[PDB]
Amino acid sequence: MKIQTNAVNVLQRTSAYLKSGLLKETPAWYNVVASIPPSTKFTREPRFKNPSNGHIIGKLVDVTEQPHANNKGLYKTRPNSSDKRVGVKRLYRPPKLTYVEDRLRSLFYKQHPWELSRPKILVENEIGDENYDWSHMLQIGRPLDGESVIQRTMYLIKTKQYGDMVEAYDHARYEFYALRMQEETEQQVALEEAEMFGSLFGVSAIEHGIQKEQEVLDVWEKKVVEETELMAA
Template identity: 45%
Template sequence: MKIQSKATTVLERTSHYLKVGVLKQKPAWYDVVGAFPPHTDLTKKPKVLELKTQKPDPFTSLFGTSRNDGTVKTRASAFDRLQKNNSISRIPQLEFLEDELRDVFYHQHPWEFSRPKTLIENKGDEYKDCDWSHMLQFNKPLDGESVVQRTLWLLADSKKNGPKLSLFEAYDKARFEFYRLRMREEMNSSVSREESVMYGAVFPTTHLEWGVQKEQEYIDVWAKVASDKTKVASANRGRGTSAGSGADEEKGAETSIWESSFEISDAEEVVEEK
């Protein structure tokens, strides 16, 4: 076997060797590479350049021409060297109608931003399971994207069969379908909560109570810092102008706000006092 340099023909050669009998066993990779053969030849081949077969560089045609005042241009000016066609080296922007629709929807419904969304996906083909002839999907939560996809479906459908819809009409139709489903969702959740309360369910904390507790943590830290600073301020005020270095001494005793911690006993005391 001579040393081979063409990587892409590895399958071809191996099958040839197997047929001839040079190799007795199929290599482990054989079936896999057979199923997914490399379709791009990545080996770099030198470009064959022969004398006088190439076209002359157009850049050189700038020089050697005589100008109006009798002088001859011999080298490129700064203007000539400037890259004029910048757009050719730029990465083209991907532009989709979906993106515009999505921005319109979310900017008109800013609170829809506050409904959390996950970006984790395994294969990236989950969109194939969706059927946008109806808005509610089995494998996708209802959100702004539903409106976008439904609008596009309505547009395509109206073009194919049925009365023609404008973009805004399709968007409005999808929007009000979305509102209807959201209203149902919210009503469902409140009714089921009510039902479970009537059956004796007790919720440990509500979001409102939890929020108050969370606020209390920060307020307690702040209260400690504030009381310390108040002491410093009142002490300085009492001393008058004669105490020059007083403020600096007091500052040493001050603790950092990150050192103090939330005391549960304090929070309870406050709740009781209410």
């Protein structure tokens, strides 16, 4: 798609018309558009930092900047093949955003498959409003999950209570586990209490599941009989 001249040069085209006398009366938008000009400078702008990491895009490590011996003990005395190629496309193609937390997230859900079954609302509430002190895991607006663990790990890393990342992660995991156990106990005891004081639940979860299975089975059975009849004949 070619860069369209005629979408942004509107006021100029109308100004010409007004000058001529093709237009008797000025549009409502004319003064407003004059006041607030369009961009009209549709450039490819280069980028020098990856925002997520903070790696430098533009720079090249020199031969003089690498004085000491390489892996396999060879001193770099020349530019290599890649150091001669003009790496301009890297300045322009947008950076792949990388986070240390992503790896931790991946690890957590590998270690805890059934944490995936806990449903996750992705529809954000005000991201600016929140204010979580990761001294502890249990934040108010946020629920208990692997995310909270990871945030705790990051906090530990920052504060240097656990200098190592792995140890901090383990600690966060252990904090999480206790909380989870407590949550589990809460629900069961609440259920027990309800049972004791004459509460009545019409459909339990397992009963519901059985009912759901039953309809499917009924559907299958009629179909299966028809298929058997088909096969016979």
